[PDB]
Amino acid sequence: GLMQFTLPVRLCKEIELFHFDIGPFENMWPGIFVYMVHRSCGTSCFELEKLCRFIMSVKKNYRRVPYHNWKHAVTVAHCMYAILQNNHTLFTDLERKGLLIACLCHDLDHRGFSNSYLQKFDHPLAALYSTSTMEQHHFSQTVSILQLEGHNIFSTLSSSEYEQVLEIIRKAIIATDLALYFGNRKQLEEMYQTGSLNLNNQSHRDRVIGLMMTACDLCSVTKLWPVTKLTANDIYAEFWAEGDEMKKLGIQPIPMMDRDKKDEVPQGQLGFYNAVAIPCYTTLTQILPPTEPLLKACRDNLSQWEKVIRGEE
Ligand SMILES: Cn1ncc(C(=O)N2CCC2)c1C(=O)Nc1ccn(C2CCCC2)n1
Ligand SMILES: [Mg+2]
Ligand SMILES: [Zn+2]
Numbered sequence: 001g002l003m004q005f006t007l008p009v010r011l012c013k014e015i016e017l018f019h020f021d022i023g024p025f026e027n028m029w030p031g032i033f034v035y036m037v038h039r040s041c042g043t044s045c046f047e048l049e050k051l052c053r054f055i056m057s058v059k060k061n062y063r064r065v066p067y068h069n070w071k072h073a074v075t076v077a078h079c080m081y082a083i084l085q086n087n088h089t090l091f092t093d094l095e096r097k098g099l100l101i102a103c104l105c106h107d108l109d110h111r112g113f114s115n116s117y118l119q120k121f122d123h124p125l126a127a128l129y130s131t132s133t134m135e136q137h138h139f140s141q142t143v144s145i146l147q148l149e150g151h152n153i154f155s156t157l158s159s160s161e162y163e164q165v166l167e168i169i170r171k172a173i174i175a176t177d178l179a180l181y182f183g184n185r186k187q188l189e190e191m192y193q194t195g196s197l198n199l200n201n202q203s204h205r206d207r208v209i210g211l212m213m214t215a216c217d218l219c220s221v222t223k224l225w226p227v228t229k230l231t232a233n234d235i236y237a238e239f240w241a242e243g244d245e246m247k248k249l250g251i252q253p254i255p256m257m258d259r260d261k262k263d264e265v266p267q268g269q270l271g272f273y274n275a276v277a278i279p280c281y282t283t284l285t286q287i288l289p290p291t292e293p294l295l296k297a298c299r300d301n302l303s304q305w306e307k308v309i310r311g312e313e
Pocket of ligand 1: 217235
């Protein structure tokens with residue numbers, strides 16, 4: 001109970017900032033995550049013996065793919081941590097518990113391929129889950145790991161608290177399906193503009209938690225330009241591998257995924273920032289004002305992508 005995790009001074013200060021990079025040392029990421037749980041949730045939220053065993057089972061069940069990997073897990077969890085710390089009083093005890101765990105687990109056992117590719121390949125998971133295929137798989141993997149002897153980090157909650165936290169996590173992980181993001185944000189925009197947005201409405205909270213999850217998931221675009229730029233190599237490395245596999249099924253992939261159309265990458269980033277990222281962080285800044293630094297960072301990085309095309313880097 002009297003055992004705090006502590007970070008070296010630079011990490012200690014910088015972890016509080018939205019644009020913090022977790023670093024290249026894998027062996028520190030677990031303790032970074034636990035540090036964030038103790039300051040977000042308290043030293044009491046989770047039996048340390050169990051939390052540590054949960055974290056390492058989850059680490060073990062992410063694969064060594066270029067992007068959708070254990071480093072993405074912890075990066076996405078840190079963004080949620082920054083959002084929760086800057087919006088202390090809007091969130092319940094349960095929500096702080098569920099959401100950092102949802103973020104850590106949201107891409108469990110990802111193979112590095114879109115729901116679209118599973119369906120064109122006719123992968124079994126596409127027969128078992130007809131929409132949000134990988135995302136229902138991720139929640140299924142999370143429940144599996146929670147049920148290993150000595151892994152139930154939630155065992156100390158009441159029956160109902162337990163059921164609420166699993167329903168928070170399930171919605172959170174399903175919301176990371178970007179096909180659902182577009183309508184979710186449209187509705188939040190309408191609801192905030194017409195003034196009907198009410199955070200005691202559970203269905204409204206669910207939508208807000210969904211936008212928070214999309215925001216944390218895309219947070220590579222809110223980092224210092226060298227982080228953003230070097231992460232997009234990892235993102236395109238999976239896209240191109242998926243394009244390759246499409247061609248193997250005798251299908252021309254979309255140019256986004258065709259490694260012969262690298263030239264078109266900066267313009268693709270423009271579409272993504274304008275059509276996805278900027279609107280995401282805009283609506284989130286409108287609903288949660290202290291998240292403005294994610295919107296400012298994202299705009300700076302769109303501007304760095306425009307610079308790339310004009311030949312200025
Ligand atoms: C940079 N970043 N971060 C996350 C993702 C992403 O979508 N992944 C991670 C799970 C799916 C991307 C990303 O580059 N997406 C892109 C790039 C090009 N497009 C097209 C759609 C709109 C216009 C062109 N979309
Ligand atoms: Mg995912
Ligand atoms: Zn993700």
